Amino acid sequence: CSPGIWQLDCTHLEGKVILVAVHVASGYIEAEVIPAETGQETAYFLLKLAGRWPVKTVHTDNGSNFTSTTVKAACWWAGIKQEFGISMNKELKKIIGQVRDQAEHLKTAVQMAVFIHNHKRYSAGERIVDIIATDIQ
Amino acid sequence: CSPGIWQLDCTHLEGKVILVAVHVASGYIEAEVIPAETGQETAYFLLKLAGRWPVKTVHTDNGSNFTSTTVKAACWWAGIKQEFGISMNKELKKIIGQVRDQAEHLKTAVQMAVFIHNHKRYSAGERIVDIIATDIQ
């Protein structure tokens, strides 16, 4: 459970696409509703994630996602490698259903579920910080 | 320099709006190009930030930004208070100019500058994690 490994996958709900990144060692999640399942959307999300967390390698359950020239360039620029050493999408989907009524847009509902997921109990949010600070010291 | 304090401001470049959040104790930055300077854009950004970092209080140099019923609801939901105890927007603008040519869209350029800002040298990214893990332990 290395501190730099993330898993990226796209799931579907209400005819929309939700891109889910999981920090594998901690269970911490970053997720966003994207207009389309394209490389430009994937490339932009990776660039944003890498500027926020130390992202060393990325795994996926759909290898074809990392074929676009655009995603390769983002991984090139950010120094990210593909992971060769290797559920929550559904716990997230359960949390979204529980909070869907409180919000008009699904995107609002996804960020609320990401909040509840990462702050629920140590929390996934406390684990990622501990794991990364430990790796620093 | 409490670990839960963030400063949010909107800056302008190329006729677009960039929303910049600074973790005050560390100098770590989260920034995004938003289509418009509205409360719905501000409310969505706060909900996303709070699900990623422990956000206790938020300060701004434009108090009118926090007047919309929408932003108040996001702060209500996320348990965020307004800060009453209290530059980088320009170091970020310097980094964006240095990298603007490498990218077509300004939004791509902003995430690259956020990456360079947070990973430059201890780094702002290393400080925020240390500060928050220290506050946990």
Ligand SMILES: CCC1=CC2(C[C@H]3CCCC[C@@H]3C2)c2c1ccc(C)c2[C@H](OC(C)(C)C)C(=O)O
């Ligand atoms: C008081 C008015 C109001 C509150 C919330 C703000 C949300 C903060 C988190 C809890 C739910 C709240 C619902 C909201 C409101 C008015 C319009 C919209 C379209 C939304 C939400 O959209 C955004 C977060 C703004 C992009 C949504 O999708 O409903």
Ligand SMILES: CCC1=CC2(C[C@H]3CCCC[C@@H]3C2)c2c1ccc(C)c2[C@H](OC(C)(C)C)C(=O)O
């Ligand atoms: C090889 C093709 C290619 C690479 C980059 C991907 C970027 C990754 C980080 C360094 C610059 C790269 C430029 C790119 C490319 C093709 C089209 C666009 C429109 C973009 C960038 O847009 C997004 C990040 C995709 C939203 C941009 O705005 O140029």
